[PDB]
Design a protein around this ligand. Structure first.
Ligand SMILES: O=C1NS(=O)(=O)c2cc(-n3cc(CCO[C@H]4O[C@@H](CO)[C@@H](O)[C@H](O)[C@@H]4O)nn3)ccc21
Ligand SMILES: [Zn+2]
Ligand SMILES: [Zn+2]
Length: 258
């Protein structure tokens, strides 16, 4: 397949099919905490997930997505740097082969073991496919994972992964509460960026939480048993499915906190 995370089709190759890979607002980035500026005009985040309706979990060959019913305002993100209402469509993770790497964003060059992306689209554009064509189409909440104590709210995800080992497999995944994946604090950094996988569209307001969540070694080990390949193809473990930091260029990272 034309893109992935291998030696021959990984991030350094993506620009050939997707020239925006070398664009002006690509993600992820390194968050230099001393250069980010506190913006007192930034509002607290409003995460309203009480009526979230998860539906399904899918191994798409690059990560696994937990998908939500986004046909109504059931789970929404508002406030912070955002104007308007953004609906939760899915979440997924990026992770490493080793605990020392796996996140996409970095903090003063520190890599975390993994990174959670809760993906939301701006309801003024009607559907996700139209939203990704707009500079304010998506809002992605990024949450770092470090290895330590288990995250209880993650275990229902971990335990279904055996049923979606290979690319193209899906399973029912109802009644999952994404609030169980949030840290205590909603302090954040924010900047304008892009999707971190092809087509790398420059449509994302990134909101990256300062406080990581802790997951156990056993939880992350279960992520690393997934496969990039389809069933009946040679096994390639789904690990190191992260894009490295891209140049910040003409962008400022703002902090919600001092
Ligand atoms: O790399 C990323 N950072 S991300 O977390 O914001 C994120 C979120 C997503 N999602 C995609 C979908 C449903 C299908 O949509 C896809 O099909 C067309 C529109 O329908 C394309 O225009 C476009 O390829 C789009 O991806 N749900 N989430 C994919 C990648 C990334
Ligand atoms: Zn391909
Ligand atoms: Zn992602």
């Amino acid at each position: 397949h034309h893109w992935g995370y291998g030696k021959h089709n990984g991030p350094e190759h993506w620009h050939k099919d997707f020239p925006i890979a070398k664009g002006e607002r690509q993600s992820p980035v390194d968050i230099d905490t001393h250069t980010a500026k506190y913006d007192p005009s930034l509002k607290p985040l409003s995460v309203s997930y009480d009526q979230a309706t998860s539906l399904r979990i899918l191994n798409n060959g690059h990560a696994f997505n937990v998908e939500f019913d986004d046909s109504q305002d059931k789970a929404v993100l508002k406030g912070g740097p955002l104007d308007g209402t953004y609906r939760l469509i899915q979440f997924h993770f990026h992770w490493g082969s080793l605990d020392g790497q796996g996140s996409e964003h970095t903090v003063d060059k520190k890599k975390y073991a993994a990174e959670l992306h809760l993906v939301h689209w701006n309801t003024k554009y009607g559907d996700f496919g139209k939203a990704v064509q707009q500079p304010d189409g998506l809002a992605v909440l990024g949450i770092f994972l470090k290895v330590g104590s288990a995250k209880p709210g993650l275990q229902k995800v971990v335990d279904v992964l055996d049923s979606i080992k290979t690319k193209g497999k899906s399973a029912d995944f109802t009644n999952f509460d994404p609030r169980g994946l949030l840290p205590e604090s909603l302090d954040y950094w924010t900047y304008p960026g892009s999707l971190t996988t092809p087509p790398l569209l420059e449509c994302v307001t990134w909101i990256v939480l300062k406080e990581p969540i802790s997951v156990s070694s056993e939880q992350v080990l279960k992520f690393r048993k997934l496969n990039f390949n389809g069933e009946g193809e040679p096994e390639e473990l789904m690990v190191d499915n992260w894009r490295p930091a891209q140049p910040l260029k003409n962008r400022q990272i703002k902090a919600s906190f001092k």
